[PDB]
């Protein structure tokens, strides 16, 4: 609670590595109840889904899948090409800024496709990150699910106790 | 950065589960340079090592191995039986209180012994937590290494961005 909401780029530089990305896929899907609840939209609502391959020192590091309300951000898909960053896009196009988020850390095995994209096998433990962010108006902005190579990644938290 | 320094008990209750423990082993070891640096003691220095089996809902959940300066806490081993908690012991016997800590999250496979103690196999992804704590006088107090069952555990962080 009350930790530092750091995006992918900073968490890599705060770890020595040089971050880069590659869009794998982008498109609209239909929200089931679970996703609808997380984005505060109605079930059946349209969701923009972005899938990116994250790299560091040139090699595959993570697959990052971001979900957002298409209804709220109907021109975001088109605008994303203009930008280096989803969050730049949200700030400049929609004046939306992340304020707070709940991050979940788990470990799991990769799917066959994931293993292929990350140059690992399906027996390597992977770090699974989920992130549920809200904006400065206290609305949910995104639900993010990422799979990190377990041999190459660690996540560091600085904790304090009052 | 600036997250909430939560001990094992709170992190379980903030997750629905009912926490219990069992001492597996306790004793002194000699610090190698790496450990000596973390506890701010001289290489060769004596370290109190505590190994505990953590349980929740009755079943095995984590193995938690804590290291402390024996020189600084020479009567801690003996005093630990009187107490429900290492941190109660440190507060009451030595007036030492955790103030800040660096926590590392990783995933790895269990050793054969670990797998046996946790009723899992060595193919299950495990969550590896390291914790390096300092006290209210800004000195290092502990270095902790824990292995959590990957099928049963998640770690939740609440992040903010100024």
Residue numbers in the entry:
A (entry chain A), B (entry chain A): 91 to 252
Question: What is the paper's account of this structure, in its own sentences?
Answer:
DasR from the Gram-positive soil-dwelling bacterium Streptomyces coelicolor is one of the functionally best characterised members of the GntR/HutC family. The DNA-binding sites for DasR are cis-regulatory elements with a length of 16 base pairs and are termed DasR-responsive elements (dre-sites). Members of this family share a common N-terminal winged-helix-turn-helix (wHTH) DNA-binding domain (DBD), but display different C-terminal effector-binding and oligomerisation domains (EBD).
While full-length DasR encompasses a homodimer in the asymmetric unit, DasR-EBD crystallised with only one monomer in the asymmetric unit and forms a homodimer with a crystallographically related neighbouring monomer. Instead of β*, the corresponding segment forms a loop that is directed towards the C-terminal end of the EBD. The conformation of this segment resembles that observed in full-length NagR in complex with DNA. The effector-binding pocket extends across both monomers in ligand-free DasR-EBD and encompasses a total solvent-accessible volume of about 440 Å3 (220 Å3 per monomer). Whereas in the ligand-free structures two surface-located openings provide access to the binding pocket in each monomer, the binding pockets are completely shielded from the outside in the effector-bound structures.
